[PDB]
Swiss-Prot record, chain C:
The keyword Translocase does not apply. Its main location: nucleus. Polyubiquitinated, probably by UBR2, which induces its degradation. One of its GO terms (biological process) is retrotransposition. GO terms for cellular component: cytoplasm; cytoplasmic ribonucleoprotein granule; cytoplasmic stress granule; nucleolus; ribonucleoprotein complex. The gene is L1RE1. This is LINE-1 retrotransposable element ORF1 protein. Residues 47-129 are annotated as: RNA recognition motif (RRM) domain. It comes from Homo sapiens. Residues 130-194 are annotated as: C-terminal domain (CTD). Changing residue 159 to A: Loss of LINE-1 retrotransposition without affecting RNA-binding.
Length: 200, 198, 200
């Protein structure tokens, strides 16, 4: 009597909690992605200089002078470029926040066209500044990216974390691994090649 | 047997959990309000262009040319850009170097009443966060009823509601805060009971 | 109704999940709160708050930019002997966005070393622009801060809201009250002193 009814009520409560728990999960998840996007957006005027030798008492002024050198040696075409701030975070990466986004895009463009950006002979690496999340997503493609590279698919990663490669004289784009699992399911060649990596 | 114990402990857990959740609920909404604001703050210099025909292979420079076209065609008297990018043609987002610049564009667009591009009507709006715009729209119905009964309402930033109750202006961040308010004022409650979904 | 022992056993299991999922989602929530704290602070780096400035009926960027100059002319002459991206209201506060962070840093040190800042004689203030999370994070390190300070523990506040004091002849850092709890759980003297504050 009194006991049986107590049980049923509890079961309804537990389920209700499970439901409210779902709608909560969704909202949290939406905030996570919302943070990811805004982080990226805010880091748009930002460039990452990689492989730049560390220095003693490396203040803002020295950094700026360094960026100048990099520009004079690689693409002096530019220019004094407006720098809102520059700082350090294997040498520590250097983050550069340009006053105008246009300035960054132009420098990246200059780098990717040049190919080998160097500093006094030593190769360095200029790259976009991404959020932890986005940056992590890109790393997860890693394993697959290499296999594709190996088999001459000419893979490429672009914003946010899109994978792209050649399949049938056409370039294919994939936002996530799931979308890719669907693609290969109808192409035995790729399916066999990417069975383990995709965890299918 | 003596299940009374186990089933009682379960109920206790159940209660605990319902309180646990309510707390997390609070913190989540807090973060949601913080995102709304941070987005609003960031996109403050941004402006939204709707109804602009897509162009085959259109670089960012052509986008800027399209911007200047609209300025000449609608605002003769009237420009620094950090960026202008795309998102039925996609919305175009124009980010000005100064927030002031955006404000003058909207005023001119509102004083002109109608904005065109090559003879075709387009639209100029802000770039407020999705969470904000929706929020503002949700106060709509209630705002209409309050205006009707001469409460002199007002919707400000972010999406605060403010009207006159007892010769004293009151502010409401969300609908819930309003529900608790009317709980001690029968007449008002009776007025907004259908709108508050109570 | 003897099979009731069946249903109850499961309900106990369901509750265990709800608890796990509950704590796990909670961890994500905090990671989000912490993330917002981080990005809000970052975005505001080039900012300074002007507090106590008499507002007018109708203002604008230019009229405000002049007022900003009067403050410099009146308080820090050798400082202007100043690149401003934009300035505007949120008497409301006035958010001053500099072109270069280094600039903001400089003037802040000028306002802090002058101690007393005035506009036409009227006392005003220039302060760092910090997130609401960080502020309240510091505010949470309030009572606990006063207890250590009063008992001569040399407590300090390291940005963002890191609490640090000297015990056992060493210097410890603490991000959240939780970590501090883990610490005093083994220091009877300290524990007894910080039990009321940590709600322990
Ligand atoms: Cl929950
Ligand atoms: Cl959250």
């Amino acid at each position: 009597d009194q006991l049986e009814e107590r049980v049923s009520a509890a079961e309804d409560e537990i389920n209700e909690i499970k439901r409210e728990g779902k709608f909560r999960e969704k909202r949290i998840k939406r905030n996570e992605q919302s943070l990811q996007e805004i982080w990226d957006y805010v880091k748009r005027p930002n460039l990452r200089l990689i492989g730049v030798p560390e220095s003693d008492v490396e203040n803002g002024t020295k950094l700026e002078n360094t960026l100048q050198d990099i520009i004079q040696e690689n693409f002096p075409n530019l220019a004094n470029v407006q720098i809102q701030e520059i700082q350090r975070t294997t040498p520590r990466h250097i983050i550069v926040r340009f006053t105008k986004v246009e300035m960054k895009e132009k420098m990246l463009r200059a780098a990717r066209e040049k190919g080998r950006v160097t500093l006094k002979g030593k190769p360095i690496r200029l790259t976009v500044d991404l959020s932890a999340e986005t940056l992590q997503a890109r790393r997860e493609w890693g394993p697959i990216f290499n296999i594709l590279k190996e088999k001459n698919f000419q893979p490429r990663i672009s914003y946010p974390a899109k994978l792209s490669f050649i399949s049938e004289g056409e370039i294919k784009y994939f936002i996530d691994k799931q979308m890719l699992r669907d693609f290969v399911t109808t192409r035995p060649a790729l399916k066999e090649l990417l069975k383990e990596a995709l965890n299918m």
